[PDB]
Design a protein around this ligand. Sequence first.
Ligand SMILES: O=c1ccn([C@H]2C[C@H](O)[C@@H](COP(=O)(O)NP(=O)(O)OP(=O)(O)O)O2)c(=O)[nH]1
Ligand SMILES: O=c1ccn([C@H]2C[C@H](O)[C@@H](COP(=O)(O)NP(=O)(O)OP(=O)(O)O)O2)c(=O)[nH]1
Ligand SMILES: O=c1ccn([C@H]2C[C@H](O)[C@@H](COP(=O)(O)NP(=O)(O)OP(=O)(O)O)O2)c(=O)[nH]1
Ligand SMILES: [Mg+2]
Ligand SMILES: [Mg+2]
Ligand SMILES: [Mg+2]
Lengths: 150, 150, 150
Amino acid sequence: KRLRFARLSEHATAPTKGSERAAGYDLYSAYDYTVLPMEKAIVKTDIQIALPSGCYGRVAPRSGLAAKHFIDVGAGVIDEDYRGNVGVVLFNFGKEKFEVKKGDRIAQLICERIFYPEIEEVQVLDDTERGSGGFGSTGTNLEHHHHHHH
Amino acid sequence: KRLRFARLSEHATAPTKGSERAAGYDLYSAYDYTVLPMEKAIVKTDIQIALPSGCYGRVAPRSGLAAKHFIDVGAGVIDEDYRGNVGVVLFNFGKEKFEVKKGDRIAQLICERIFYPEIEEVQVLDDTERGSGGFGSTGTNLEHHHHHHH
Amino acid sequence: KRLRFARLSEHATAPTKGSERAAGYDLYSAYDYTVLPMEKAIVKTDIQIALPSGCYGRVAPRSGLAAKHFIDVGAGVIDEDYRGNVGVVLFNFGKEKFEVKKGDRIAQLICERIFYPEIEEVQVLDDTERGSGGFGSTGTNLEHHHHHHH
Ligand SMILES: O=c1ccn([C@H]2C[C@H](O)[C@@H](COP(=O)(O)NP(=O)(O)OP(=O)(O)O)O2)c(=O)[nH]1
Ligand SMILES: O=c1ccn([C@H]2C[C@H](O)[C@@H](COP(=O)(O)NP(=O)(O)OP(=O)(O)O)O2)c(=O)[nH]1
Ligand SMILES: O=c1ccn([C@H]2C[C@H](O)[C@@H](COP(=O)(O)NP(=O)(O)OP(=O)(O)O)O2)c(=O)[nH]1
Ligand SMILES: [Mg+2]
Ligand SMILES: [Mg+2]
Ligand SMILES: [Mg+2]
């Protein structure tokens, strides 16, 4: 229902939606950072958020910075009970420095709906058709897909 | 309920499920790409999608390509209102070239359920037990976990 | 509602919550691994899980390892029908070796709520205000955001 935030400084910007049904609110750097090639920066938003009940806040990469500048977002799990400064962990996999300026949109926050399950240790799980299958078990192409189901 | 898609070319493949309760529909490259070591490619699916109400489309990495070939997916946030070509941002962190061929399953699309909250600026948030705690505050092992809760 | 797990060895640890409303259960390595710079390891938890109905298990990076050690999690999509050993695909983008020890919390499992939609091929999708817009279409700063909506 409501995403609450408070400013921790004059340098913060209220997050904004790129489009009417955008998955995420864009997050603004409060500061300048130089991210050297193959290095990381923790970008302060200088906001604290209170996420609505039944989600967490996922810090996700924008596609523009990813495709154009080889920028990625690490970490990314903002918990419903976190009241600290929301930090964006930026990864520069590019060959050139990446310059963040105060007021640049360098990530997006998604209200990812989750269950908060109680954990239950059991001795044996039920079986499934997938079973232990993983790590490319279903193959690479359309034939492999359809072979797998026979 | 329904994931709608339309083909933007003869080169596209309808996405397929790896298993009965797979989280994602596998996405097929429509083209050949050579991804050099420590470089990226934007892989066209040549599909446009209309995601159901209450989710976005997350482009996620397959575990086979990740574990075997050090392949990763950047960006990944397909918005409910996006009607463009779904692009997969592929990252090759491996030492060898990675070859994508038309018809290779090189990612998966998950209908991630999200809230579309209205954003509300407040002066002060409520407090929590976690508070400002983050960035490894709870430590590395089982003792650290249980110490934290005392 | 319930996250079921079974131990596949004496070396496993039941996953634990970092905080009362943590998004994820922390996952413990069952073994020692040396992750060389710019290399990957598949870390065995030696647990199998049965995820509740209506989610998948996303293996997500912790922020401490990300910010301090340039550690990232690849792959990450644990399907509801998977009954195998949950593996964490760890990426070391740092300059130094990263040492995993048995009993280290090196990732977190989130019960990400998803739709399992039936897929429907159509000839034409409806139009939207975003349309084909993506890959940085809305720009870099607050002016660009507000220009875009005019
Ligand atoms: O990080 C991960 C990712 C996947 N897995 C396992 C469980 C999951 O259900 C299974 C398949 O995951 P993906 O569908 O994401 N990868 P891929 O498509 O390559 O495997 P498959 O061909 O078997 O579906 O691999 C892990 O153990 N750790
Ligand atoms: O990208 C991020 C990730 C996390 N955080 C903050 C908020 C989050 O609630 C808190 C802890 O996140 P994680 O649980 O994902 N990382 P870690 O387990 O290392 O921290 P902790 O030991 O405090 O739980 O760190 C950020 O500010 N930016
Ligand atoms: O992996 C992706 C990510 C995004 N996209 C497309 C669809 C999505 O709706 C659109 C915008 O995604 P983001 O909002 O995550 N990136 P960015 O903010 O840079 O683009 P924009 O300024 O247009 O919102 O780009 C892809 O095709 N593949
Ligand atoms: Mg955007
Ligand atoms: Mg799969
Ligand atoms: Mg944590």
